[PDB]
Design a binder for this molecule. Structure first.
Ligand code: A1B5S
Ligand code: ZN
Length: 139
């Protein structure tokens, strides 16, 4: 679990969104595993606007942060799960690292701010849904 709070927006994994996220929907994209909902309180986070390919992410299943090198956002095949059929997920960045069920929502950050959130795992890999291209989160 986990979310990004920026301005009057809450960014979560689409497959973990709650009834309240859907009742306050701003934007969602099943192909990216993202959903953004509106909040009444001002958020705690700032978004990176950069091309970093190294950063640090939080892994809840180990209660620790790990440094990673990750690929540029791309279209990657993701196997069928109880949340989605087998499909290509877009704007996804892979890295070698630990990720198990429950780790989705962990934040990946670089020196410029939040880069994205954990969205895929298994096989000694961790995949992150990029948010750096969503410029409207800042306004
Ligand atoms: C994080 C899990 C670790 C063990 C192996 C499976 C890993 O699950 C996943 O990669 N997904 C399940 C939830 C939905 C994700 C998505 N963005 O489509 C894909
Ligand atoms: Zn950066």
């Amino acid at each position: 679990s986990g979310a990004i709070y920026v301005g009057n927006y809450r960014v979560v994994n689409r497959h973990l969104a709650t009834h309240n996220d859907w009742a306050n929907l701003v934007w969602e994209d099943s192909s990216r595993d993202l959903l953004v909902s509106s909040t009444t309180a001002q958020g705690c986070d700032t978004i990176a606007r950069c091309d970093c390919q190294t950063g640090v992410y939080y892994c809840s299943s180990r209660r620790k942060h790990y440094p990673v090198s990750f690929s540029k956002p791309s279209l990657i095949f993701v196997e069928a799960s109880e949340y989605y059929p087998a499909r290509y997920q877009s704007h996804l960045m892979l890295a070698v690292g630990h990720s198990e069920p429950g780790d989705c929502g962990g934040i990946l950050r670089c020196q410029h701010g939040v880069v994205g959130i954990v969205s895929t795992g298994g096989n000694g890999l961790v995949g992150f849904a990029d948010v750096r291209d969503l410029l409207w989160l800042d306004e």
